[PDB]
RNA sequence: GAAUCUCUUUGCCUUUUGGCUUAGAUCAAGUGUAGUAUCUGUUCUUGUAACAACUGAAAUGACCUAGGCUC
RNA sequence: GUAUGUCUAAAUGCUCUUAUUUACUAACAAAAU
RNA sequence: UAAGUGAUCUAGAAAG
């Protein structure tokens, strides 16, 4: 089971059944991995910003996207499905915030 | 790590075509894949007697057989197979063929149907 | 479950295989008929 | 067969594991009492 | 690719094996069939490995042929197989080095 | 009377059994359903003469303390 | 839910074939108008 | 002479 540096774990070969049995990590480890991935994503965005790659505004937007899209961006919810509540809350915030923020200004 | 795994990890340099070619090159050398009598799990439809030790293996009894392709097909473009079995008691190689003209099987120097 | 063989390709009693066989026969049979008639005609001529 | 009934249970003491069981977690530290 | 063999000979695994062979020199002489005609093997290590494999095979053959149903024909057949294996082993002990 | 051995009967003996569940379920089925995996052959691989030079290699063993000559 | 167990001394490149699969797994589930 | 305002559940992963 090889770890990407983005924390998305997945298998090298197709595992024989014994191997699979041995190597089913559970709800702890996966959760941890997810958390790490999230961290990387926020940290990655800041790194990008620091590097000339992306504007401050862009960085901010990226961060916002990450925080709202945790749900899509990376499976935490899979492993612990009360993160679903958090996701929902984030979505709600986005809905509220976006409507406040894009009043006279248009969709984008 | 989980049977429904979407994407298997590949190295950062994995020219898929090239990889395939390489595999092919190392398939003639390979032990398994370059052989006949590839394994299979099957229940026995015929319900027959093992000719050596007379062990009455009944219908639907499960075995780890060997399926092999018979080169001489039925008619033209519909294959037929030899399906090896062992008797439980004595280790005599029973087998049978699947001639699809009658929608049924044929015994092949293993046992007799009854 | 019961009869395993029913979930195998090689099993001829599987319906798909049977269908395939029928198709093969049907095509081949048709061809034979086409040729058979011709043969008959030839014989008649002779 | 080995599908088998039984004769007796057990109770043998080893070195403790030091595992953080969920139920074992603290809860109701305060014991109540009677009036007298 | 049920029953493990398929998995083993799945393309990815093969590729991995090839890579290993290329870099570091991990071969599995179990995995490939031993060649028929010796003297198409200039390296010594490879030859040694082959010899080892054949020895192992011979041992395996030996282990099974003393089974209790001695009158069965499989055992008899193996006796010839055993002989063949022995011959192969002998051949592998060629005198080039 | 005492020692022992052989047979029969009674007692003692596996005059027969180490779980539970919907008797565990079923003696039926164009199955459906989910998953997991890649293949066919055909081929590439100058002579003759004269002059200058050497007459001989390899194996292991016989001597001396890996090395040195002889057979 | 893709079972399992024993067993182990320390030729080179080449290309051509595809509108497919000798494909394998059945632990899973089983009805009519 | 007076209709027609608003109430909006959800939400996937493993093993079996
Ligand atoms: Mg279970």
From Swiss-Prot, chain A:
Signal peptide interval: none
Q: Where in or outside the cell?
A: Nucleus
The UniProt record's further free-text remark is: Present with 468 molecules/cell in log phase SD medium.
Domain free text = The MPN (JAB/Mov34) domain has structural similarity with deubiquitinating enzymes, but lacks the residues that would bind the catalytic metal ion. Contains a region with structural similarity to reverse transcriptase, presenting the classical thumb, fingers and palm architecture, but lacks enzyme activity, since the essential metal-binding residues are not conserved.
Quaternary state and interactors = Component of the U4/U6-U5 tri-snRNP complex composed of the U4, U6 and U5 snRNAs and at least PRP3, PRP4, PRP6, PRP8, PRP18, PRP31, PRP38, SNU13, SNU23, SNU66, SNU114, SPP381, SMB1, SMD1, SMD2, SMD3, SMX2, SMX3, LSM2, LSM3, LSM4, LSM5, LSM6, LSM7, LSM8, BRR2 and DIB1.
Tell me what this protein is called.
Pre-mRNA-splicing factor 8
Q: Which organism is it from?
A: Saccharomyces cerevisiae (strain ATCC 204508 / S288c)
User: What does the organism's lineage look like at the top?
Assistant: Eukaryota, Fungi, Dikarya, Ascomycota, Saccharomycotina
From Swiss-Prot, chain B:
This chain belongs to the protein called Splicing factor YJU2
Q: How does it assemble?
A: Component of the spliceosome. Present in the activated B complex, the catalytically activated B* complex which catalyzes the branching, the catalytic step 1 C complex catalyzing the exon ligation, and the postcatalytic P complex containing the ligated exons (mRNA) and the excised lariat intron. Interacts (via C-terminus) with CLF1. Interacts (via N-terminus) with SYF1. Interacts with U2 snRNA; this interaction is direct.
* Other facts noted in the record for this chain: Present with 2250 molecules/cell in log phase SD medium.
Question: Species name for this entry?
Answer: Saccharomyces cerevisiae (strain ATCC 204508 / S288c)
Induction notes from the record:
Expressed in exponential-phase cells grown in rich medium.
Name the family: Belongs to the CWC16 family. YJU2 subfamily.
* Residues shown, of full length: 2 to 115 of 278
Q: Where is Zn(2+) bound in this sequence?
A: 50, 53, 87, 90
Q: What is the lineage of its organism?
A: Eukaryota, Fungi, Dikarya, Ascomycota, Saccharomycotina
Signal peptide bounds: none
Q: Where in the cell is it found?
A: Nucleus
From Swiss-Prot, chain C:
What are the subcellular locations of this protein? Nucleus
Domain of life the protein comes from: Eukaryota
- The chain's disulfide connectivity reads none
Q: Which residue windows are coiled coil?
A: 23-46
The family this protein is said to belong to: Belongs to the CWC25 family.
What's in the misc comment field? Present with 861 molecules/cell in log phase SD medium.
Instruction: Describe the task this protein carries out.
Output: Involved in pre-mRNA splicing.
User: Could you describe the subunit structure of this protein?
Assistant: Belongs to the CWC complex (or CEF1-associated complex), a spliceosome sub-complex reminiscent of a late-stage spliceosome composed of the U2, U5 and U6 snRNAs and at least BUD13, BUD31, BRR2, CDC40, CEF1, CLF1, CUS1, CWC2, CWC15, CWC21, CWC22, CWC23, CWC24, CWC25, CWC27, ECM2, HSH155, IST3, ISY1, LEA1, MSL1, NTC20, PRP8, PRP9, PRP11, PRP19, PRP21, PRP22, PRP45, PRP46, SLU7, SMB1, SMD1, SMD2, SMD3, SMX2, SMX3, SNT309, SNU114, SPP2, SYF1, SYF2, RSE1 and YJU2.
What name appears for this protein in its UniProt entry?
A: Pre-mRNA-splicing factor CWC25
Whose protein is this, by species?
A: Saccharomyces cerevisiae (strain ATCC 204508 / S288c) (Baker's yeast)
Lineage, uppermost ranks = Eukaryota, Fungi, Dikarya, Ascomycota, Saccharomycotina
Which part of the full protein is shown? 3 to 48 of 179
UniProtKB/Swiss-Prot annotation, chain E:
Say which domain of life the source belongs to.
Eukaryota
Instruction: List cellular component terms (GO).
Output: catalytic step 2 spliceosome; cytoplasm; post-mRNA release spliceosomal complex; post-spliceosomal complex; Prp19 complex; U2-type catalytic step 1 spliceosome; U2-type catalytic step 2 spliceosome
Question: Mainly resides where?
Answer: cytoplasm
What are the GO BP annotations of this UniProt entry? generation of catalytic spliceosome for second transesterification step; mRNA 3'-splice site recognition; mRNA splicing, via spliceosome
Q: Which UniProt keywords apply?
A: Cytoplasm, mRNA processing, mRNA splicing, Nucleus, Spliceosome
- Where would you find this protein in the cell? Cytoplasm; Nucleus
Please report which protein family the annotation says this sequence is part of. Answer: Belongs to the ISY1 family.
Describe the task this protein carries out. Answer: Involved in pre-mRNA splicing and cell cycle control. As a component of the NTC complex (or PRP19-associated complex), associates to the spliceosome to mediate conformational rearrangement or to stabilize the structure of the spliceosome after U4 snRNA dissociation, which leads to spliceosome maturation. The cell cycle arrest of SYF2 defective cells may be due to the inefficient splicing of TUB1. Also involved in DNA repair.
An additional note in the Swiss-Prot or TrEMBL entry is: Present with 1990 molecules/cell in log phase SD medium.
Q: Summarize the subunit comment.
A: Belongs to the NTC complex (or PRP19-associated complex), composed of at least CEF1, CLF1, ISY1, NTC20, SNT309, SYF1, SYF2, and PRP19.
What protein am I looking at?
Answer: Pre-mRNA-splicing factor ISY1
Its organism's taxonomic lineage begins at: Eukaryota, Fungi, Dikarya, Ascomycota, Saccharomycotina
């Amino acid at each position: 089971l090889h770890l990407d540096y983005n924390f998305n774990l997945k298998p090298t070969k197709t595992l024989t059944t014994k191997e699979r049995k041995k190597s089913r990590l559970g709800n702890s480890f996966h959760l941890m991995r997810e958390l790490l991935k999230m961290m990387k994503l926020i940290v990655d965005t800041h790194v990008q910003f620091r590097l000339g790659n992306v504007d401050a505004f862009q960085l901010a937007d990226g961060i916002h996207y990450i925080l709202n899209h945790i749900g899509q961006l990376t499976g935490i919810y899979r492993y612990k499905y009360k993160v679903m509540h958090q996701i929902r809350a984030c979505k709600d915030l986005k809905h509220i915030i976006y409507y406040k923020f894009n009043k006279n200004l248009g969709k984008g | 790590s989980e049977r429904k795994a979407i994407n298997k990890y590949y190295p950062p340099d994995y020219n898929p075509l090239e990889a395939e070619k390489l595999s092919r090159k190392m398939a003639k050398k390979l032990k398994t894949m370059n052989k006949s009598h590839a394994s299979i799990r099957l229940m026995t439809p015929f319900s027959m007697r093992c000719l050596e030790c007379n062990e009455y293996i009944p219908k639907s009894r499960k075995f780890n057989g060997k399926k092999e392709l018979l080169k001489e097909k039925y008619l033209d473009s519909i294959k037929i197979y030899r399906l090896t079995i062992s008797c439980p008691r004595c280790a005599n190689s029973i087998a049978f063929r699947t001639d699809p003209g009658n929608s049924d099987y044929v015994m092949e120097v293993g046992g007799v149907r009854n | 479950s019961g009869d395993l063989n029913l979930l195998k390709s090689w099993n001829p009693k599987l319906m798909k295989n049977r269908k395939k066989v029928w198709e093969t026969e049907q095509d081949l049979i048709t061809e034979q008929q086409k040729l058979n008639t011709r043969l008959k005609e030839i014989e008649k001529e002779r | 067969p080995q599908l088998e009934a039984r004769s007796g249970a057990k109770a043998a003491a080893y070195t403790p594991t030091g595992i953080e069981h969920a139920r074992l977690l603290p809860g109701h530290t305060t014991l109540k009492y009677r009036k007298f | 690719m049920s029953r493990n063999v398929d998995k083993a000979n799945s393309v990815l695994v093969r590729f991995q094996e090839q890579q290993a062979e290329s870099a570091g020199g991990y071969k599995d002489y179990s995995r490939y069939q031993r060649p028929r005609n010796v003297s198409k093997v200039k390296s010594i290590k490879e030859a040694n490995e082959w010899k080892r494999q054949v020895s192992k095979e011979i041992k395996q053959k030996s282990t099974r042929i003393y089974d209790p149903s001695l009158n069965e024909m499989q055992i008899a057949e193996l006796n010839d197989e055993l002989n063949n294996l022995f011959k192969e082993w002998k051949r592998w002990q060629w005198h080039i080095d």
